[PDB]
From Swiss-Prot:
Impact noted for substituting V36A: Partial loss of mono-ADP-ribosylhydrolase activity
Subunit-level organization: Interacts with mRNA-capping enzyme nsP1. Interacts (via C-terminus) with host G3BP1; this interaction inhibits the formation of host stress granules on viral mRNAs and the nsp3-G3BP1 complexes bind viral RNAs and probably orchestrate the assembly of viral replication complexes. Interacts (via C-terminus) with host G3BP2; this interaction inhibits the formation of host stress granules on viral mRNAs and the nsp3-G3BP2 complexes bind viral RNAs and probably orchestrate the assembly of viral replication complexes. Interacts (via C-terminus) with host NAP1L1.
Phylogenetic lineage: Viruses, Riboviria, Orthornavirae, Kitrinoviricota, Alsuviricetes
Annotated residues for binding of ADP-D-ribose: D13, N27, G35, G115, V116, Y117
Membrane topology, record value: Peripheral membrane protein
Comment, domains: In the N-terminus, the macro domain displays a mono-ADP-ribosylhydrolase activity. The central part called, the alphavirus unique domain (AUD) has a zinc-binding function. The C-terminus region, also called hypervariable domain (HVD), is mainly disordered and binds several host proteins. This intrinsically disordered domain contains 2 SH3 domain-binding sites and 2 FGDF motifs necessary and sufficient for the formation of nsP3/G3BP complexes.
Interval of the full protein contained in this chain: 1334 to 1493 of 2474
Outcome of substituting N27 to R/Y: Almost complete loss of mono-ADP-ribosylhydrolase activity
Posttranslational modification: Phosphorylated by host on serines and threonines.
Task performed by this protein: Seems to be essential for minus-strand RNAs and subgenomic 26S mRNAs synthesis. Displays mono-ADP-ribosylhydrolase activity. ADP-ribosylation is a post-translational modification that controls various processes of the host cell and the virus probably needs to revert it for optimal viral replication. Binds proteins of G3BP family and sequesters them into the viral RNA replication complexes thereby inhibiting the formation of host stress granules on viral mRNAs.
Protein name in UniProt: Non-structural protein 3
Organism of provenance: Chikungunya virus (strain S27-African prototype) (CHIKV)
Documented effect of changing N27A: Partial loss of mono-ADP-ribosylhydrolase activity; complete loss of ADP-ribose 1'' phosphate phosphatase activity
C-alpha cells in the first residue's frame, strides 16, 4: 500500500503516467478504439491480447510486467440512465478489485464513460463519485488523468473538498 494513500489529478495523456499500472477506458471487444483507448493501444498494444470483456467489468492484461486494467464503462447512447449508472459503478468496483489483487501502490485512472460513451452529457461528477465509491477502501495512490483545463479544476476541487 501507499504510506498515506492519496487522490491526485493531472491534465495530460494517461499513456505518459508515472504510476505502477494503468486503467484503460476500454471497449467490450478489445478493439484499439479512440481517445484514451487508442493512446493505451499505441503505448501497450501487447495488453490487448484477449482483453475483450463485458460492460461493467475489468480485465487485466500484462504488457511486460506493467498491468493494463481494461475497464468497460457503459455507452450511455445505448443504456438507459438507470442501467448505465449501475454498469458505470460496477466497472469501477471491478477496477478496485484488480488494483487490490495486483498489490500495486499506485494506479493511473481516466473518468469512465465521460467521453464518446457519455451519450453527449457531462458526467464528470457521476463518473468521479463512482470512482471514489470504489477506490476509497483501497490503499493505492490514485492519479486521475484528464485533458480539459476546466475538468482538471473541477476534479481537483472535488478531491480537496474531502481532505
Ligand atoms: Cl500530454
Ligand atoms: Cl468514454
Ligand atoms: Cl477531460
Amino acid at each position: 500500500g501507499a504510506m498515506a494513500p492519496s487522490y491526485r489529478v493531472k491534465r495530460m495523456d494517461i499513456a505518459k503516467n508515472d504510476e505502477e499500472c494503468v486503467v484503460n477506458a476500454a471497449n467490450p471487444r478489445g478493439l484499439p478504439g479512440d481517445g484514451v483507448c487508442k493512446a493505451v493501444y499505441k503505448k501497450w498494444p501487447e495488453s490487448f491480447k484477449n482483453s475483450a470483456t463485458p460492460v461493467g467489468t475489468a480485465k487485466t492484461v500484462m504488457c511486460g510486467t506493467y498491468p493494463v486494467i481494461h475497464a468497460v464503462g457503459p455507452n450511455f447512447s445505448n443504456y438507459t440512465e438507470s442501467e448505465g449508472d449501475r454498469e458505470l459503478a460496477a466497472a469501477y468496483r471491478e477496477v478496485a478489485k484488480e488494483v487490490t489483487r495486483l498489490g500495486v501502490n499506485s494506479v493511473a485512472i481516466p473518468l469512465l464513460s465521460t467521453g464518446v460513451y457519455s451519450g453527449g452529457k457531462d458526467r464528470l461528477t457521476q463518473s468521479l463519485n463512482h470512482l471514489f465509491t470504489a477506490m476509497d477502501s483501497t490503499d493505492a495512490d490514485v492519479v486521475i488523468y484528464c485533458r480539459d483545463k476546466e475538468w482538471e479544476k473541477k476534479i481537483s476541487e472535488a478531491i480537496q473538498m474531502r481532505t
